[PDB]
Ligand binder design. Structure first.
Ligand code: MN
Ligand code: MN
Ligand code: MN
Length: 201
């Protein structure tokens, strides 16, 4: 089939908000999205998974975690997750500080992705084109804050999470895995997948 461009794939297949956030992140880190294109797509994918992980999850009036998939959460519901990823450096650390000196949870050494108000912990999300165990170990060896919970998704449906604690219900994680499948399938249709997979390194 014809080889498409990754740029076209990213612009067509991700919400413009996600794409803009990804471009902003690459700029902050001195990366060119028109050159490291596989990285660009990976950044978009990771941001989308961070958002999907938080979507629909609230803390109810009694303090219990609940799922609301309708458009209107009742006014008293509180979002279960704080999203750190997607924020510029100053704001991300600002949020992390606000959570920490507040909830009493200690301050991480690297910016995590999410904070979970039900489980009272930061979360590092990962999305890998490689084996989940290898990637889990890479993440873990990097941070070892060891209050930070790690949850890795792959494009083939495998997951690995700290202490075999997966945080979310099966259906929430199935939504993420379905999206990852869809991304893989669409990139493959455009003859972009093999190279994207091999680029992770
Ligand atoms: Mn809301
Ligand atoms: Mn992050
Ligand atoms: Mn991450």
């Amino acid at each position: 089939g014809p080889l498409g461009s990754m740029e076209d794939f990213v612009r067509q297949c991700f919400n413009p908000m996600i794409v803009e956030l990804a471009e902003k992140a690459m700029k902050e880190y001195g990366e060119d999205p028109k050159i490291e294109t596989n990285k660009f797509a990976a950044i978009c994918t990771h941001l989308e998974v961070c958002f999907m992980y938080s979507d629909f999850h609230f803390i109810d009036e009694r303090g219990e975690s609940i799922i609301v998939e309708s458009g209107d959460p009742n006014a008293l519901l509180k979002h279960r997750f704080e999203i750190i990823e997607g924020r510029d450096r100053i704001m991300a650390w600002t949020v992390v500080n606000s959570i920490c000196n507040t909830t009493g949870v200690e301050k991480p050494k690297f910016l995590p992705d999410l904070y979970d108000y039900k489980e009272n912990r930061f979360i590092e999300i990962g999305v890998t084109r490689r084996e989940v165990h290898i990637y889990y170990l890479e993440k873990a060896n990097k941070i070892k804050s060891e209050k930070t919970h790690i949850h890795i998704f792959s494009f083939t449906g495998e997951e690995m999470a700290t202490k075999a604690d997966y945080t979310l219900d099966e259906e929430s994680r199935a939504r993420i895995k379905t999206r990852l499948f869809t991304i893989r399938q669409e990139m493959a249709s455009r003859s972009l997948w093999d190279s994207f997979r091999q680029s992770e390194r």
